Amino acid sequence: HHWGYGKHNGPEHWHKDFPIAKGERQSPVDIDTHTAKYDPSLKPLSVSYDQATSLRILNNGHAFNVEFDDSQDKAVLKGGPLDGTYRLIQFHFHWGSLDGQGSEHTVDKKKYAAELHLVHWNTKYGDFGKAVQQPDGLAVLGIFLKVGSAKPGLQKVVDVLDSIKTKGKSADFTNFDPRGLLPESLDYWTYPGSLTTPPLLECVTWIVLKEPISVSSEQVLKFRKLNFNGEGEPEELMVDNWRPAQPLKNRQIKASFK
Numbered sequence: 001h002h003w004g005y006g007k008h009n010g011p012e013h014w015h016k017d018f019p020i021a022k023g024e025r026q027s028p029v030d031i032d033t034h035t036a037k038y039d040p041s042l043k044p045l046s047v048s049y050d051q052a053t054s055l056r057i058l059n060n061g062h063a064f065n066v067e068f069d070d071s072q073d074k075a076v077l078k079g080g081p082l083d084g085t086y087r088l089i090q091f092h093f094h095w096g097s098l099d100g101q102g103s104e105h106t107v108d109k110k111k112y113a114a115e116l117h118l119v120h121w122n123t124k125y126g127d128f129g130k131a132v133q134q135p136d137g138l139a140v141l142g143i144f145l146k147v148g149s150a151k152p153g154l155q156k157v158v159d160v161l162d163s164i165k166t167k168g169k170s171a172d173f174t175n176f177d178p179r180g181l182l183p184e185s186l187d188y189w190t191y192p193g194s195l196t197t198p199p200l201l202e203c204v205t206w207i208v209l210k211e212p213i214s215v216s217s218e219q220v221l222k223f224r225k226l227n228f229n230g231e232g233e234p235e236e237l238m239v240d241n242w243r244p245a246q247p248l249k250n251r252q253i254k255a256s257f258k
């Protein structure tokens with residue numbers, strides 16, 4: 001599988017190897033804020049990250065993942081639209097070549113400079129690989145990034161990127177606190193969707209926070225120095241690693257707030 005974000009292997013091509021790309025609950029989507037419905041029965045999100053154990057950071061040739069110990073209930077998401085306990089396995093970002101693009105979800109067609117995805121799996125399915133085969137297997141917390149003031153809690157991530165410049169490189173990344181990436185408010189939109197990269201499985205309850213976080217231009221510039229290619233291969237900057245909005249089809253986006 002040689003999928004990517006280039007002209008010859010990008011999102012418009014993914015359906016040839018992954019036919020679910022044209023399915024009924026693909027992500028991301030545009031969030032029409034005037035069409036989303038407030039649902040008063042939606043509960044507040046419960047983000048319990050105090051015992052989180054980060055292990056490693058990896059450049060996988062499409063983004064970088066910060067990975068966590070998901071062998072115990074150390075960092076979990078529950079409540080909101082979710083039934084059960086969802087364990088944090090990794091987070092990653094999508095970002096642009098310019099500050100006016102980079103997010104996967106859009107809000108009233110507005111694009112943010114980047115988007116953070118905190119990926120969690122439903123513990124009733126035992127492991128991530130089983131969870132991705134279920135319609136309620138994953139819960140992804142999505143957070144928009146806008147360029148402005150620096151985010152202090154992001155800087156530890158930025159400072160390690162030089163050690164994982166190319167595809168396949170990893171580095172130890174212990175004692176990172178993902179709570180430093182969250183905005184003040186946990187108000188959210190939610191809808192059923194999919195992974196946004198191949199295999200594009202329709203297994204995600206998306207929880208997209210309304211409040212973006214601010215990062216500095218210097219922080220996002222360091223993301224843009226990463227490479228899609230392996231060491232010794234022709235340099236292709238890791239930028240614009242986002243899938244565009246897909247048709248909503250027979251879905252409704254719900255809001256936790258009025």
Ligand SMILES: O=C(O)c1ccccc1O
Nearest residue numbers: 003004005006007228236
């Ligand atoms: O593999 C990619 O994601 C890619 C992206 C941009 C340009 C060329 C590429 O191969």
Ligand SMILES: O=C(O)c1ccccc1O
Nearest residue numbers: 158161162165222225226
């Ligand atoms: O110093 C950086 O911020 C950096 C980031 C990504 C890749 C190579 C780098 O030197």
Ligand SMILES: O=C(O)c1ccccc1O
Nearest residue numbers: 117119195196197198199
């Ligand atoms: O978010 C995704 O698209 C994804 C895809 C494959 C594996 C883990 C993931 O989070």
Ligand SMILES: O=C(O)c1ccccc1O
Nearest residue numbers: 229230231232233234235
């Ligand atoms: O291994 C290579 O082919 C190579 C090519 C360009 C620069 C550094 C390298 O190691």
Ligand SMILES: [Zn+2]
Nearest residue numbers: 092094117196
């Ligand atoms: Zn993602």
